Amino acid sequence: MANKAVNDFILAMNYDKKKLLTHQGESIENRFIKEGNQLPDEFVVIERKKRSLSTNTSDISVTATNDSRLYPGALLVVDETLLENNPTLLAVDRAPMTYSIDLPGLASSDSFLQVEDPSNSSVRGAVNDLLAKWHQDYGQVNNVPARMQYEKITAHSMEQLKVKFGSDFEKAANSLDIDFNAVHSGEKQIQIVNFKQIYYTVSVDAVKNPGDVFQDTVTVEDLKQRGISAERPLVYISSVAYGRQVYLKLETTSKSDEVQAAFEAAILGVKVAPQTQWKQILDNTEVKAVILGGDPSSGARVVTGKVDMVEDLIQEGSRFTADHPGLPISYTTSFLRDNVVATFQNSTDYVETKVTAYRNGDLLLDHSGAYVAQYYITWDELSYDHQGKEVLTPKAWDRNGQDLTAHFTTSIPLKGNVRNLSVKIRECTGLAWEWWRTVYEKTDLPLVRKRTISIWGTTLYPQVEDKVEND
């Protein structure tokens, strides 16, 4: 009867499929805090980051994988962690389960066995057990059907400049001589190497009822007290594929600025003749990659990154058996409630980060162009009263609108408690048809630890760039 009750409870939730699944957040955030009027007053904030191919991690990734190693038989609560590729695996002892491992070719009887329900004992013990068996009995013969996938995208370009100028002045009195010589040389190099391959593929046996989720003696009331309401559902890991992933990225820049001026003179009286030169060399070399696959011999070469990396890795480790061990790549979990809601996550999860600042956090304004813009820094400021109502006292900056031709640098540090900040940095283009232009504009900006707003360019193409960091 308990099992039936558990099933009825699971059936009862009628959570919307689109809204519930689409439960994500934004970029940065901020949360204030005020209580009482006799102690102190502080404020904090919260920001979020994302990874993909730019700023990735390997150790971190590995750690994440270990945390969510529910290849078969899982139950992640659909709330926030799931969407962020990192939820909880809270699940009471359940019934036995079976996992199939389709490959190049195997037996039927041995193909499917019997697995229990643990964290990293049966799933890792059973899978590994069978995995070794295949490599043991089956020496070679059949070839593992591994789907290869790798794309290469490089981008290298250089730029040169040779400006020569030579003129001399001579009148019926004084004689002069000018000499200008400068050369420009700037070339950049960009190349992105990618590589992916999946061989191992684990799958689970769809669930019919709560027989796999809960055992004989289950508690529908004790399990609901933990964290199983209507807002969040129980998500269980579906299938899983193994394999590796070859990564490679490197970029090298170069620039040269040689200045050589030659001045000559010979006027009736004094003889001045001087000549100065100039030199400047800038180099930038950076390389980084990651091999999720997990190789050895053909691993060092790839890591270094030369010419025989991809090939050396895609020619020595073809036959997937034991030579090259696999590694968790993709991840797929299913919702154990109505055999419908299925989530499709990746392998790289986002890393949360939250800090606090007592009286830190100031706004900087770096202007380096050939245009006159009027900064409109204006923000409000709350405050507690004797009764218990939060008042408001807007206080605009001292320089609320005015022309400021380059160079121009400043910064409006914060000030304890605050809220809202209207800034209007409209650059003056002048022209003839218009008069005022609005480049950058943001409403109710988030109190960032260290935000910077600089605009590089001329009076035609505003190349503004806002910098917001929170170390």
Coordinates of C-alpha atoms in Angstrom, one line a residue:
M1 CA 0.0 0.0 0.0
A2 CA 2.9 2.3 0.8
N3 CA 4.3 1.9 -2.8
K4 CA 0.8 2.7 -4.2
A5 CA 0.7 5.8 -2.0
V6 CA 4.1 6.9 -3.2
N7 CA 3.0 6.4 -6.8
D8 CA -0.2 8.4 -6.3
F9 CA 1.8 11.2 -4.8
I10 CA 4.2 11.2 -7.7
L11 CA 1.3 11.3 -10.1
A12 CA -0.4 14.2 -8.3
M13 CA 2.2 16.9 -9.2
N14 CA 1.2 18.7 -12.4
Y15 CA 4.0 21.1 -12.8
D16 CA 4.3 23.0 -16.1
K17 CA 6.9 21.5 -18.5
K18 CA 8.1 24.7 -20.0
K19 CA 8.2 27.0 -17.1
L20 CA 9.7 24.5 -14.7
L21 CA 12.4 23.4 -17.0
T22 CA 13.2 26.9 -18.1
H23 CA 14.4 28.0 -14.6
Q24 CA 17.7 29.9 -15.2
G25 CA 19.2 33.1 -14.0
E26 CA 21.1 36.1 -15.5
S27 CA 24.6 37.4 -15.2
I28 CA 25.4 39.5 -12.1
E29 CA 23.1 40.3 -9.2
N30 CA 22.9 42.1 -5.8
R31 CA 21.2 41.7 -2.5
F32 CA 20.9 44.3 0.2
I33 CA 20.4 43.8 3.9
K34 CA 19.0 46.2 6.6
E35 CA 17.6 45.3 10.0
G36 CA 17.5 47.5 13.1
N37 CA 18.8 51.0 13.8
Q38 CA 21.3 50.8 16.7
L39 CA 24.0 48.4 15.6
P40 CA 25.5 48.7 12.1
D41 CA 24.7 48.6 8.4
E42 CA 26.3 46.6 5.6
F43 CA 25.5 45.4 2.1
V44 CA 26.5 42.4 -0.1
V45 CA 26.2 41.2 -3.7
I46 CA 26.1 38.2 -5.9
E47 CA 27.5 37.5 -9.4
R48 CA 27.4 34.6 -11.8
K49 CA 29.8 33.3 -14.5
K50 CA 29.7 30.9 -17.4
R51 CA 32.2 28.6 -19.2
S52 CA 32.4 26.9 -22.5
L53 CA 35.6 27.2 -24.5
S54 CA 37.2 30.5 -23.4
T55 CA 37.8 30.3 -19.6
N56 CA 37.6 26.5 -18.9
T57 CA 39.0 24.5 -16.1
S58 CA 40.4 20.7 -15.9
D59 CA 40.8 19.8 -12.2
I60 CA 37.5 21.6 -11.5
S61 CA 35.8 19.7 -14.3
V62 CA 37.1 16.4 -12.9
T63 CA 35.8 17.3 -9.4
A64 CA 32.4 18.1 -10.8
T65 CA 32.3 14.8 -12.7
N66 CA 33.1 12.9 -9.4
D67 CA 30.3 14.7 -7.7
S68 CA 27.8 13.9 -10.4
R69 CA 28.9 10.4 -11.3
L70 CA 25.4 9.0 -11.5
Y71 CA 25.8 7.2 -14.8
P72 CA 22.9 4.9 -14.0
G73 CA 20.1 5.4 -11.5
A74 CA 19.9 9.0 -10.4
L75 CA 17.4 11.5 -8.9
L76 CA 18.3 15.1 -9.2
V77 CA 15.9 17.6 -7.7
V78 CA 14.7 20.0 -10.4
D79 CA 15.1 23.4 -8.7
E80 CA 18.3 25.4 -9.5
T81 CA 21.3 23.0 -9.3
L82 CA 20.0 20.9 -12.2
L83 CA 19.9 24.0 -14.5
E84 CA 23.4 24.8 -13.3
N85 CA 24.7 21.3 -14.0
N86 CA 25.2 20.6 -10.3
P87 CA 22.3 19.3 -8.1
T88 CA 21.9 16.9 -5.2
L89 CA 21.8 13.1 -5.4
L90 CA 19.7 12.6 -2.3
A91 CA 17.9 9.2 -2.8
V92 CA 16.9 6.6 -0.2
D93 CA 17.7 2.9 -0.8
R94 CA 15.8 1.7 -3.8
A95 CA 15.3 -1.6 -5.7
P96 CA 17.7 -3.3 -8.0
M97 CA 18.4 -2.0 -11.5
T98 CA 19.9 -3.1 -14.8
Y99 CA 22.2 -1.2 -17.2
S100 CA 23.1 -2.1 -20.8
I101 CA 26.4 -1.3 -22.5
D102 CA 25.9 -1.4 -26.3
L103 CA 29.2 -1.6 -28.3
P104 CA 30.7 -3.1 -31.4
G105 CA 29.3 -6.5 -30.6
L106 CA 28.7 -8.7 -27.5
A107 CA 26.6 -11.5 -26.1
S108 CA 22.9 -11.3 -25.1
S109 CA 22.9 -13.1 -21.7
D110 CA 26.0 -11.3 -20.5
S111 CA 24.9 -8.1 -22.1
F112 CA 22.4 -7.4 -19.3
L113 CA 22.9 -8.2 -15.6
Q114 CA 21.7 -6.9 -12.3
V115 CA 22.7 -3.7 -10.5
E116 CA 21.7 -2.2 -7.1
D117 CA 21.4 1.5 -6.1
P118 CA 24.3 3.4 -4.5
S119 CA 26.4 6.5 -4.9
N120 CA 29.7 5.2 -6.4
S121 CA 29.9 1.5 -5.5
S122 CA 27.5 -0.5 -7.7
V123 CA 27.5 1.9 -10.6
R124 CA 31.2 2.2 -10.6
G125 CA 31.7 -1.4 -9.5
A126 CA 29.3 -3.0 -11.9
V127 CA 30.2 -0.9 -15.0
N128 CA 33.9 -1.4 -14.4
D129 CA 33.4 -5.1 -13.8
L130 CA 31.7 -5.7 -17.1
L131 CA 34.0 -3.3 -18.9
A132 CA 37.0 -5.4 -18.0
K133 CA 35.3 -8.6 -18.9
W134 CA 34.8 -7.4 -22.5
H135 CA 38.5 -6.6 -22.8
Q136 CA 39.4 -9.9 -21.2
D137 CA 37.5 -12.5 -23.1
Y138 CA 37.2 -10.5 -26.4
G139 CA 40.8 -9.9 -27.4
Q140 CA 40.3 -7.9 -30.6
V141 CA 38.5 -9.1 -33.8
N142 CA 35.5 -6.8 -33.6
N143 CA 36.2 -3.1 -33.9
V144 CA 34.6 -0.6 -31.5
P145 CA 32.3 1.8 -33.4
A146 CA 33.6 5.1 -32.1
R147 CA 32.1 8.3 -33.6
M148 CA 34.8 10.8 -34.4
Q149 CA 34.1 14.5 -34.4
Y150 CA 36.7 17.4 -34.6
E151 CA 36.8 20.7 -36.4
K152 CA 39.7 23.0 -37.0
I153 CA 39.4 26.8 -37.1
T154 CA 42.4 29.0 -37.5
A155 CA 42.8 32.8 -38.1
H156 CA 46.2 34.4 -38.8
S157 CA 46.7 37.8 -40.3
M158 CA 49.5 40.4 -40.3
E159 CA 49.7 44.2 -41.0
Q160 CA 52.6 46.4 -42.2
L161 CA 53.1 50.1 -42.9
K162 CA 56.0 52.0 -44.5
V163 CA 55.8 55.8 -44.4
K164 CA 58.7 57.7 -45.9
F165 CA 59.0 61.5 -46.0
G166 CA 61.9 63.8 -46.8
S167 CA 61.9 67.5 -47.4
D168 CA 64.2 70.5 -47.0
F169 CA 63.8 74.3 -46.7
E170 CA 66.2 76.9 -48.1
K171 CA 65.6 80.6 -48.5
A172 CA 67.8 83.6 -49.6
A173 CA 68.9 83.8 -46.0
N174 CA 68.7 80.6 -43.9
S175 CA 69.0 77.0 -45.1
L176 CA 67.2 74.1 -43.4
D177 CA 66.7 70.3 -44.0
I178 CA 64.0 67.9 -42.8
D179 CA 64.1 64.1 -42.8
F180 CA 61.3 61.8 -41.6
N181 CA 61.4 58.0 -41.7
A182 CA 59.1 55.5 -39.9
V183 CA 57.9 52.0 -40.5
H184 CA 54.9 50.1 -39.2
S185 CA 54.7 46.4 -38.7
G186 CA 52.0 44.5 -36.9
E187 CA 50.9 40.9 -37.5
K188 CA 48.7 38.7 -35.4
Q189 CA 48.2 34.9 -35.3
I190 CA 45.1 32.9 -34.1
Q191 CA 44.4 29.2 -34.4
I192 CA 41.8 27.0 -32.7
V193 CA 42.1 23.3 -32.7
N194 CA 39.2 21.0 -31.7
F195 CA 38.8 17.2 -31.3
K196 CA 36.1 14.9 -29.8
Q197 CA 35.4 11.2 -29.8
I198 CA 32.8 9.1 -28.0
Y199 CA 33.0 5.3 -27.8
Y200 CA 31.5 3.9 -24.5
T201 CA 27.8 4.4 -24.2
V202 CA 25.8 3.5 -21.1
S203 CA 22.0 3.4 -20.9
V204 CA 19.3 2.8 -18.3
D205 CA 16.1 0.8 -18.3
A206 CA 13.3 3.3 -18.3
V207 CA 11.2 3.3 -15.1
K208 CA 7.5 2.3 -15.0
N209 CA 6.6 3.4 -11.4
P210 CA 8.2 4.2 -8.1
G211 CA 9.6 0.7 -7.9
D212 CA 13.1 1.9 -8.8
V213 CA 12.8 5.2 -6.9
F214 CA 11.7 3.7 -3.6
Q215 CA 12.0 0.3 -2.0
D216 CA 9.5 -1.8 0.0
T217 CA 9.5 0.2 3.3
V218 CA 9.3 3.8 1.9
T219 CA 8.1 7.0 3.5
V220 CA 6.0 9.3 1.4
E221 CA 5.8 11.8 4.3
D222 CA 9.4 11.5 5.3
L223 CA 10.7 11.9 1.7
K224 CA 8.5 15.0 1.2
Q225 CA 9.9 16.7 4.3
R226 CA 13.4 16.7 2.8
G227 CA 13.0 18.5 -0.5
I228 CA 10.3 17.1 -2.8
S229 CA 7.5 19.6 -3.4
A230 CA 5.6 20.7 -6.5
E231 CA 8.1 23.4 -7.5
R232 CA 10.9 20.9 -7.9
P233 CA 10.6 17.4 -9.3
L234 CA 12.8 14.3 -9.0
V235 CA 15.3 14.0 -11.9
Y236 CA 17.0 10.7 -12.5
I237 CA 20.1 10.1 -14.7
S238 CA 19.1 8.6 -18.1
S239 CA 21.9 7.5 -20.4
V240 CA 25.6 8.3 -20.5
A241 CA 28.4 8.1 -23.1
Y242 CA 32.2 7.8 -22.5
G243 CA 35.3 8.8 -24.5
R244 CA 37.8 11.6 -24.6
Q245 CA 38.2 15.1 -25.9
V246 CA 41.2 16.7 -27.6
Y247 CA 41.6 20.5 -27.1
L248 CA 44.2 23.0 -28.3
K249 CA 44.4 26.8 -28.4
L250 CA 47.3 29.3 -28.9
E251 CA 47.8 32.8 -30.1
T252 CA 50.8 35.0 -30.9
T253 CA 50.9 38.7 -31.6
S254 CA 53.7 41.0 -32.9
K255 CA 54.2 44.7 -33.4
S256 CA 57.0 47.0 -34.4
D257 CA 57.3 50.8 -34.2
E258 CA 60.5 52.2 -35.5
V259 CA 60.9 56.0 -35.6
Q260 CA 63.9 57.7 -37.2
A261 CA 63.9 61.5 -37.8
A262 CA 66.8 63.4 -39.4
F263 CA 67.0 67.1 -39.0
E264 CA 69.6 69.3 -40.8
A265 CA 70.2 73.0 -40.8
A266 CA 72.9 75.5 -42.0
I267 CA 71.7 79.1 -41.5
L268 CA 74.1 82.1 -41.6
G269 CA 75.3 82.2 -38.0
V270 CA 74.8 78.9 -36.2
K271 CA 75.1 75.4 -37.4
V272 CA 72.6 73.0 -35.8
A273 CA 72.5 69.4 -36.9
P274 CA 70.9 66.5 -34.9
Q275 CA 69.4 63.1 -35.5
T276 CA 67.5 60.7 -33.3
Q277 CA 66.1 57.2 -33.8
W278 CA 63.3 55.0 -32.2
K279 CA 62.6 51.3 -31.6
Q280 CA 59.8 49.2 -30.2
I281 CA 59.2 45.5 -30.1
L282 CA 56.1 43.8 -28.6
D283 CA 55.7 40.0 -28.4
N284 CA 52.9 37.9 -27.0
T285 CA 52.8 34.1 -26.9
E286 CA 50.2 32.0 -25.0
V287 CA 49.1 28.4 -25.3
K288 CA 46.6 26.3 -23.4
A289 CA 44.6 23.1 -24.0
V290 CA 42.9 20.1 -22.3
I291 CA 42.6 16.4 -23.0
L292 CA 39.4 15.1 -21.4
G293 CA 40.1 11.8 -23.2
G294 CA 43.0 10.7 -21.0
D295 CA 45.9 9.5 -23.1
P296 CA 49.6 8.8 -22.3
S297 CA 52.2 8.4 -25.0
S298 CA 50.3 10.6 -27.5
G299 CA 49.4 12.9 -24.6
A300 CA 52.5 14.9 -24.1
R301 CA 52.8 15.8 -27.8
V302 CA 49.2 17.0 -27.9
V303 CA 49.6 18.9 -24.6
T304 CA 52.7 20.7 -26.0
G305 CA 50.9 21.5 -29.3
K306 CA 53.1 21.4 -32.4
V307 CA 52.2 19.8 -35.7
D308 CA 51.8 16.1 -35.1
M309 CA 49.3 16.4 -32.3
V310 CA 45.8 15.5 -33.7
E311 CA 47.2 12.9 -36.0
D312 CA 49.5 11.3 -33.4
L313 CA 46.4 11.2 -31.2
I314 CA 44.0 10.0 -33.9
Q315 CA 46.2 7.2 -35.2
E316 CA 47.7 5.4 -32.2
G317 CA 44.6 5.3 -30.1
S318 CA 42.0 4.1 -32.6
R319 CA 41.1 0.6 -31.3
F320 CA 39.2 1.3 -28.1
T321 CA 39.9 -1.6 -25.8
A322 CA 42.4 -1.0 -23.0
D323 CA 45.3 1.0 -24.5
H324 CA 43.4 4.3 -24.0
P325 CA 41.0 4.5 -21.1
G326 CA 37.7 6.4 -21.5
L327 CA 36.5 9.5 -19.6
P328 CA 33.1 10.9 -18.8
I329 CA 32.0 13.4 -21.5
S330 CA 28.3 14.1 -22.0
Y331 CA 25.5 13.7 -19.4
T332 CA 21.8 12.9 -19.7
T333 CA 19.3 12.7 -16.8
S334 CA 15.6 11.8 -16.9
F335 CA 12.8 12.9 -14.6
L336 CA 11.3 9.9 -12.6
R337 CA 7.7 11.0 -12.3
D338 CA 5.8 10.5 -15.6
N339 CA 8.5 9.2 -18.0
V340 CA 8.4 12.4 -20.0
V341 CA 10.3 15.3 -18.6
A342 CA 13.9 14.7 -19.8
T343 CA 16.8 17.1 -19.2
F344 CA 19.8 17.3 -21.5
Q345 CA 22.9 18.8 -19.9
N346 CA 26.5 18.9 -20.9
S347 CA 29.8 18.1 -19.2
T348 CA 30.9 21.6 -18.1
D349 CA 29.0 23.2 -15.3
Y350 CA 28.9 26.8 -14.1
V351 CA 30.8 28.0 -11.0
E352 CA 29.0 30.2 -8.5
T353 CA 30.7 33.1 -6.7
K354 CA 29.5 35.5 -4.0
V355 CA 31.4 38.1 -2.0
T356 CA 30.8 41.1 0.2
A357 CA 32.1 44.7 0.5
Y358 CA 32.0 46.9 3.6
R359 CA 32.6 50.3 2.0
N360 CA 34.3 49.3 -1.3
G361 CA 33.1 49.5 -4.9
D362 CA 33.7 52.7 -6.9
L363 CA 32.8 53.7 -10.5
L364 CA 35.6 54.8 -12.8
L365 CA 35.4 56.8 -16.0
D366 CA 38.3 56.7 -18.4
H367 CA 37.9 58.9 -21.6
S368 CA 40.5 58.7 -24.3
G369 CA 39.2 60.0 -27.6
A370 CA 38.7 63.1 -29.7
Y371 CA 35.1 64.0 -28.8
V372 CA 33.3 66.1 -26.1
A373 CA 30.8 64.1 -24.1
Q374 CA 28.7 65.1 -21.1
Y375 CA 28.6 62.6 -18.2
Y376 CA 25.3 62.4 -16.3
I377 CA 26.2 60.6 -13.0
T378 CA 23.0 60.6 -10.9
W379 CA 21.9 58.1 -8.2
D380 CA 19.6 57.8 -5.2
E381 CA 20.3 57.0 -1.6
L382 CA 17.9 55.3 0.8
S383 CA 17.9 55.7 4.6
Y384 CA 16.2 54.5 7.8
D385 CA 13.9 56.7 9.8
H386 CA 12.8 56.8 13.5
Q387 CA 9.5 55.2 12.8
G388 CA 10.4 52.5 10.4
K389 CA 10.1 53.8 6.9
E390 CA 12.8 53.9 4.2
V391 CA 13.1 57.4 2.9
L392 CA 14.9 58.6 -0.2
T393 CA 17.4 61.5 -0.9
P394 CA 18.6 61.6 -4.5
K395 CA 22.1 63.2 -4.8
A396 CA 23.5 64.0 -8.2
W397 CA 27.3 64.3 -8.8
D398 CA 29.0 67.7 -8.7
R399 CA 29.7 67.4 -12.5
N400 CA 26.2 66.5 -13.8
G401 CA 26.6 67.4 -17.5
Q402 CA 29.6 69.2 -19.1
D403 CA 32.1 69.0 -21.9
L404 CA 35.3 67.0 -21.2
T405 CA 37.8 66.7 -24.1
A406 CA 40.5 64.0 -23.7
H407 CA 42.3 63.4 -21.7
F408 CA 39.8 62.9 -18.9
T409 CA 39.9 60.4 -16.0
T410 CA 37.8 60.1 -12.8
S411 CA 35.8 57.8 -10.6
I412 CA 32.7 58.0 -8.4
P413 CA 33.4 55.7 -5.5
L414 CA 30.3 54.3 -3.7
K415 CA 29.2 55.3 -0.2
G416 CA 27.8 52.8 2.3
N417 CA 24.2 51.9 1.6
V418 CA 22.7 52.9 -1.8
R419 CA 20.3 51.9 -4.6
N420 CA 19.9 52.8 -8.3
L421 CA 22.3 54.9 -10.4
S422 CA 21.3 56.9 -13.5
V423 CA 24.3 57.6 -15.8
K424 CA 24.0 59.4 -19.1
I425 CA 27.4 59.5 -21.0
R426 CA 26.2 61.1 -24.2
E427 CA 29.1 62.1 -26.5
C428 CA 28.9 65.3 -28.6
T429 CA 29.4 64.5 -32.3
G430 CA 28.4 68.0 -33.4
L431 CA 28.0 67.4 -37.1
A432 CA 25.3 69.5 -38.7
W433 CA 22.1 67.4 -38.7
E434 CA 22.3 66.2 -35.1
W435 CA 23.6 67.7 -31.8
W436 CA 23.7 65.1 -29.1
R437 CA 24.3 61.3 -29.3
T438 CA 23.7 58.6 -26.7
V439 CA 26.5 56.1 -26.6
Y440 CA 26.4 54.2 -23.3
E441 CA 23.3 53.9 -21.1
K442 CA 22.3 51.7 -18.3
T443 CA 19.5 51.8 -15.7
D444 CA 19.6 50.4 -12.1
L445 CA 23.2 49.1 -12.6
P446 CA 24.4 46.4 -10.2
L447 CA 26.8 47.3 -7.5
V448 CA 29.9 45.5 -8.8
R449 CA 33.1 45.2 -6.8
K450 CA 35.1 47.0 -9.5
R451 CA 33.3 48.3 -12.5
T452 CA 35.1 50.4 -15.2
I453 CA 33.7 52.2 -18.3
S454 CA 36.2 53.3 -21.0
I455 CA 35.6 54.5 -24.5
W456 CA 38.4 54.2 -27.1
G457 CA 38.1 55.6 -30.6
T458 CA 37.5 58.8 -32.5
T459 CA 34.4 61.0 -33.2
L460 CA 32.8 58.6 -35.6
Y461 CA 32.8 55.1 -34.2
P462 CA 32.3 55.0 -30.4
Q463 CA 34.3 52.0 -29.2
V464 CA 33.1 52.1 -25.6
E465 CA 33.9 49.1 -23.3
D466 CA 32.5 48.5 -19.8
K467 CA 34.7 46.5 -17.5
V468 CA 33.0 44.9 -14.5
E469 CA 35.0 42.5 -12.3
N470 CA 34.6 41.1 -8.8
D471 CA 37.7 39.5 -7.4

